[PDB]
UniProtKB/Swiss-Prot annotation, chain B:
Alphabetical list of SUPFAM superfamilies matching this protein: Ribosomal protein L6
Gene3D superfamilies xrefs: Ribosomal protein L6, alpha-beta domain
Gene: RPL9A
Protein name: Large ribosomal subunit protein uL6A
Task of the protein: Component of the ribosome, a large ribonucleoprotein complex responsible for the synthesis of proteins in the cell. The small ribosomal subunit (SSU) binds messenger RNAs (mRNAs) and translates the encoded message by selecting cognate aminoacyl-transfer RNA (tRNA) molecules. The large subunit (LSU) contains the ribosomal catalytic site termed the peptidyl transferase center (PTC), which catalyzes the formation of peptide bonds, thereby polymerizing the amino acids delivered by tRNAs into a polypeptide chain.
GO (cellular component) term, any one: cytosolic large ribosomal subunit
Predominant place of localization: cytoplasm
From Swiss-Prot, chain C:
Organism: Saccharomyces cerevisiae (strain ATCC 204508 / S288c)
Superkingdom of origin: Eukaryota
Residue list for modification N-acetylserine: S1
Miscellaneous comment text of the record: Present with 45300 molecules/cell in log phase SD medium.
Gene3D superfamilies: 2.30.30.30, 6.10.250.2270
Name used for this protein in its record: Large ribosomal subunit protein eL14A
Gene name of the record: RPL14A
Posttranslational mods: N-terminally acetylated by acetyltransferase NatA.
Curated annotation (Swiss-Prot), chain D:
Function: Component of the ribosome, a large ribonucleoprotein complex responsible for the synthesis of proteins in the cell. The small ribosomal subunit (SSU) binds messenger RNAs (mRNAs) and translates the encoded message by selecting cognate aminoacyl-transfer RNA (tRNA) molecules. The large subunit (LSU) contains the ribosomal catalytic site termed the peptidyl transferase center (PTC), which catalyzes the formation of peptide bonds, thereby polymerizing the amino acids delivered by tRNAs into a polypeptide chain.
Keywords, in A-Z order: Acetylation, Cytoplasm, Isopeptide bond, Phosphoprotein, Ribonucleoprotein, Ribosomal protein, Ubl conjugation
Protein name per Swiss-Prot or TrEMBL: Large ribosomal subunit protein uL13B
Additional free-text comment from the UniProt record: There are 2 genes for uL13 in yeast.
Modification sites for Phosphoserine: S42, S180, S184, S186
UniProtKB/Swiss-Prot annotation, chain E:
GO CC list: cytosol; cytosolic large ribosomal subunit
Keyword Manganese: no
Family annotation (InterPro entries): Ribosomal_eL20, Ribosomal_eL20_dom, Ribosomal_eL20_eukaryotes
Tagged with keyword Ubl conjugation: yes
Organism (species): Saccharomyces cerevisiae (strain ATCC 204508 / S288c) (Baker's yeast)
Designated name of the protein: Large ribosomal subunit protein eL20A
Something else known: Present with 54300 molecules/cell in log phase SD medium.
HAMAP family: Ribosomal_eL20
Subunit structure: Component of the large ribosomal subunit (LSU). Mature yeast ribosomes consist of a small (40S) and a large (60S) subunit. The 40S small subunit contains 1 molecule of ribosomal RNA (18S rRNA) and 33 different proteins (encoded by 57 genes). The large 60S subunit contains 3 rRNA molecules (25S, 5.8S and 5S rRNA) and 46 different proteins (encoded by 81 genes). eL20 forms multiple interactions with RNA and proteins in the central protuberance, connecting components of core functional centers that are located far apart.
Length: 106, 189, 135, 197, 171
RNA sequence: UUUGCUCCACACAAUAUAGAUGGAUACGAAUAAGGCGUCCUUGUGGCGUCGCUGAACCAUAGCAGGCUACGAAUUGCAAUGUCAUUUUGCGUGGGGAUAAAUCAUUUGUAUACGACUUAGA
RNA sequence: AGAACUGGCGAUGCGGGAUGAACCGAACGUAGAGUUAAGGUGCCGGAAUACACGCUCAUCAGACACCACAAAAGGUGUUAG
RNA sequence: GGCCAGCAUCAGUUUUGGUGGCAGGAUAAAUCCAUAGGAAUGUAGCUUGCCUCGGUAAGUAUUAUAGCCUGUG
């Protein structure tokens, strides 16, 4: 009763990058509980939302959402990549996104 | 090469109890008690008998198995101290000026005071350790007898005298004075 | 005199006949027994009843259980199985609190949502009695 | 998973803790290190003291109130170690270090709370037994920290007040265990044990 | 590497003057047939007048171990080139297989002498049969009766970074 | 000149979030050692048990969650489908409180100018 | 200071070597996806506080070749022979 | 009537897993099964100071009231 959620919380770590160069088209997500690329392969295709606030109420809400998905994995510790419609703003480094289960294969 | 097992034995006499827990050794006997903290050496004591104790080190390297024999010798000294005691004898030596030695009780603990060390005026004072019992000879008049259980304190308080009664800015081949250890025996034996 | 109190530690020391639990590898969770000793860091094992092959493994992939039994140095697979069946090791192991917790983890992982719901309602009833009892 | 993470820094290694932190507090976790005076650092005391003196040697010549500010307390030593692992010249790093709070001893808000342990920084697990290590309290006190004799007078007090709490809670625990053991044979529980519970 | 043992037969190329030359055999340790065939022509070209071009390889066969589930004392006679001079050595190992003994010999040689694979020639590997010819203590200390020992200081691995109880090293 | 100010109750209007929407669940010390239970001859005691990960423990069903102690459909196959948390203004009504600083003048323990130190109903 | 062969810079950006005209990799239309090079994976910093056998405790350790310095002579300090 | 999404069936490029069949090698080696021989980090058994049914020991003994190794098949 106290809980109603159907998502898994994860963190927007950073962009895809080399040393001294970044690709904002691609973002890195740390999902909770995940520790390997296997057992992260479950979360591929799954949708992601970054939920934030804004002061200008549009379509009847102050909260706004940026949607995306999980594309593939990252190396050896359960990190993944994501690609949103409109890439994320880089002030979200260390911010909670929420991964859904909407395209399912269970 | 890292070894597999290296052990030593300790022969406990009668009436001596050796309580050990977390490498804090505690030997009680007729004369007194003695405690020691060996929490800097990785060692296992295992009792086999009331008559002797086994100490062991695994995987070695000629460092741990080097300190193992040291631990053995320490515990043996601890055990023979509470039974036979320790008795150190230090003799006076002067060419010209008699070294007047006495014992005093200052505001704090007891001290041992010496005077006329080569015609000086400085009053050299040394603090007796907390365990020793210090006396002056009676069959002769130029001998001081330290005694106790802890050799580690008795020899140290003996060496303090020999250090303060040193010669400075003169030649030591010639100038042979002070207090010098003659004998390091036990009380009973 | 008074008993000289000497206690430091009592280990699961490695030796022949000791039973081990493998934690990493193809045969993890499956039991085995030590036959003899290769070196300081590694050994060889043989678990016939568990389906383990005769191996030669480091001591990082294993865990040393308390229980053990007696077999000769360098024994073969058929001998190990005999002595294992004799000393009844797979019942002495299952009776431990260790193994009960292992099976509990496996069960709790193998559960489905309906059983997870059953457990919630079964625990409600249990704490109901307990909290009517402790007041 | 917790919103805030309280870390007992006793028997912990400095850099090995600070890296873990500096990653977690950049990923967005609010972290509170506590009891930093009992931290440990490898190598012998004289060696670490030589290194700290080499650090003290470095001060801006033309005006020494511009240069490396040599903080002598352990909290600030660890803060230095973390800040070296963080890009503190940016908003990312500044925001990150605003998510950190380090203390000597264990103050009130964090004495009645739960403390955790980083096992990939623990001395007993990482260091070989027999190697010499160093304690940050003794070090700071050697280089000019004047409040070791105070946190000690406070920590024993905290400890007394905590041990009495444990002494009460342990009795409550045995009472609850003896009250719950009278229902374990019941069909509500031997039906649970078929599901592992 | 993950070594293997090979059996390489070779033959100087036939001619009308001698159309049945002498087959030379080598028992070589290596990771694959390619470098095995390379080392064969390295050692044979030290002893006899032949090369790859002036010769051929007849048969190349993997030698597997006969009793790989048996602990054995492998004595090893080897030579290695240092930064200043060339030397010989004898080492005893207590592994179950010839190839594993070699794999751990290359390693501790590289540790204790900083000698690489390109410097070492493995002359002889001998399974010692009896427990009386062993002369090295780091082996003899495992040939005792009722051998047992503990692992005092245990370190459990961790998949999570934060733990809520101090660990114990008890085994 | 209760036209002004403060805290409390709520009617709220507006703004900004370095980013929870089940629970930040409390002994201490050692780690080549300990915890827990129990018995006593209460000790560095005897016995028993445990660890090998918190993979736990607790809470958790109910119109975003109800009336009694029936309804929830047609948001039509998904689109945060909002409850958080500070600050700020306004009004309602309930009490509570009634001052200093600066300039200018002056002093010289001070002083480039500021500043400092003094005095003045 | 003066020559030979090749390659390059000059005329040349790009990833790496923190930084660098010349080194390593590799040579460029605008973009997307994938894979790699040389180099790297504690944190800064994207990536294993990965596995394995060993050595070392240094009172100015040591740590990506060109490269940014190091010899002769000694040590029962240790390891192996 | 168009723009933004979702799903399905397809195509191209690609990544990541599960799983079946077949071949080769010393027609894998080993394990396992039978047999010969042998030995010790020496098992029953036999002389053994007492002492826990030979606990201890130092000798004997080559499978016996444990087993091992080698070879052959």
């Amino acid at each position: 009763a106290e809980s109603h959620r159907l998502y898994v919380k994860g963190k927007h770590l950073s962009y895809q990058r080399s040393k001294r160069v970044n690709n904002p088209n691609v973002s890195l997500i740390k999902i909770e509980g995940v520790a390997t690329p296997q057992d992260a392969q479950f979360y591929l295709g799954k949708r992601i939302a970054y939920v934030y606030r804004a002061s200008k109420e549009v379509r009847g809400s102050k909260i706004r959402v940026m949607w995306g998905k999980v594309t593939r994995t990252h190396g050896n510790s359960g990190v993944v990549r994501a690609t949103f419609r409109n890439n994320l703003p880089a002030k979200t480094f260390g911010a909670s996104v929420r991964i859904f289960l909407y395209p399912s294969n269970i | 090469m890292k070894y597999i097992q290296t052990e030593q034995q300790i022969e406990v006499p009668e009436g001596v109890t050796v309580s050990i827990k977390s490498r804090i050794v505690k030997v009680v006997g007729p004369r007194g008690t003695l405690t020691k903290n060996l929490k800097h050496i990785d060692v296992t004591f295992t009792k086999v008998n009331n008559q002797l104790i086994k100490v062991a080190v695994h995987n070695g390297g000629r460092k741990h198995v080097a300190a193992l024999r040291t631990v053995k010798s320490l515990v043996d000294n601890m055990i023979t101290g509470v039974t036979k005691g320790y008795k150190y004898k230090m003799r006076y030596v002067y060419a010209h000026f008699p070294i007047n030695v006495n014992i005093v009780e200052k505001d704090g603990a007891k001290f041992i005071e010496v005077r006329n060390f080569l015609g000086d005026k400085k009053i050299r004072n040394v603090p007796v350790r907390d365990g020793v019992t210090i006396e002056f000879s009676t069959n002769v008049k130029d001998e001081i007898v330290l005694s106790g259980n802890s050799v580690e304190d008795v020899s140290q308080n003996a060496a303090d005298l020999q250090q303060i009664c040193r010669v400075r800015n003169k030649d030591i081949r010639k100038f042979l004075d002070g207090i010098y250890v003659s004998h390091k025996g036990f009380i009973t034996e | 005199s008074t008993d000289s109190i000497v206690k430091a530690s009592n280990w699961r020391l490695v030796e022949v006949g000791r039973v081990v639990l493998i934690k990493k590898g193809q045969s993890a969770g499956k039991l085995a027994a030590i036959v003899e000793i290769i070196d300081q860091k590694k050994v060889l094992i043989d678990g016939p009843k568990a389906g383990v092959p005769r191996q030669a493994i480091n001591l990082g992939q294993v865990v040393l259980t308390p229980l053990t039994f007696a077999l000769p140095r360098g024994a073969r697979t058929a001998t190990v199985s005999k002595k294992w069946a004799a000393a009844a090791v797979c019942e002495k192991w299952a009776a431990s609190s260790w193994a009960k917790k292992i099976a509990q983890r496996e069960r709790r992982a193998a559960l489905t949502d309906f059983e997870r719901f059953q457990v919630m309602v079964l625990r409600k009833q249990k704490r109901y009695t307990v909290k009517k009892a402790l007041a | 998973s917790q919103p805030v993470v309280v870390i007992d820094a006793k028997d912990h290694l400095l850099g090995r803790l600070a890296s873990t932190i500096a990653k977690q507090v950049l990923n967005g976790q609010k972290i509170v290190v506590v009891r930093a005076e009992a931290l440990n650092i490898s190598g012998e005391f004289f060696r670490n003291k030589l290194k700290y003196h080499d650090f003290l040697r470095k001060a801006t010549a033309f005006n020494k109130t511009r240069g490396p500010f040599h903080f002598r307390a352990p909290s600030r030593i660890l803060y230095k170690a973390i800040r070296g692992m963080v890009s503190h010249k940016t908003a990312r790093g500044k925001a990150a270090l605003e998510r950190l709070k380090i203390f000597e001893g264990i103050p009130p808000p964090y004495d009645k709370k739960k403390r955790v342990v980083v096992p990939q920084a623990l001395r007993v697990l990482r260091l070989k037994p027999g190697r010499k290590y160093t304690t940050l309290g003794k070090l700071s006190t050697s280089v000019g920290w004047k409040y070791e004799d105070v946190v000690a007078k406070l920590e024993d007090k905290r400890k007394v007040r905590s041990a009495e709490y444990y002494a009460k809670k342990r009795a409550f625990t045995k009472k609850v265990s003896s009250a719950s053991a009278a229902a374990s044979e019941s069909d509500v529980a031997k039906q649970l044990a078929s599901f592992g519970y | 590497a993950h070594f293997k043992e090979y059996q390489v037969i070779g033959r100087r190329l036939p001619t009308e003057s001698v159309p049945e030359p002498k087959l030379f055999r080598m028992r070589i340790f290596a990771s694959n047939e390619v470098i095995a065939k390379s080392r064969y022509w390295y050692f044979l070209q030290k002893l006899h007048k032949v090369k790859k071009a002036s010769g051929e390889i007849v048969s190349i066969n993997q030698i597997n171990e006969a009793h790989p589930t048996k602990v054995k004392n492998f004595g090893v006679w080897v030579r290695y080139d240092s930064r200043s001079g060339t030397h010989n050595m004898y080492k005893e190992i207590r592994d179950v297989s010839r190839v594993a003994a070699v794999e751990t010999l290359y390693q501790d040689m590289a540790a204790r002498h900083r000698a690489r694979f390109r410097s070492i020639h493995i002359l002889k590997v001998a399974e010692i049969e009896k427990t009386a010819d062993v002369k090295r203590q780091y082996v003899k200390q495992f040939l005792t009766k009722d051998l047992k020992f503990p692992l005092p200081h245990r370190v459990q691995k961790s998949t999570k970074t934060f733990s809520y109880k101090r660990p114990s090293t008890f085994y």
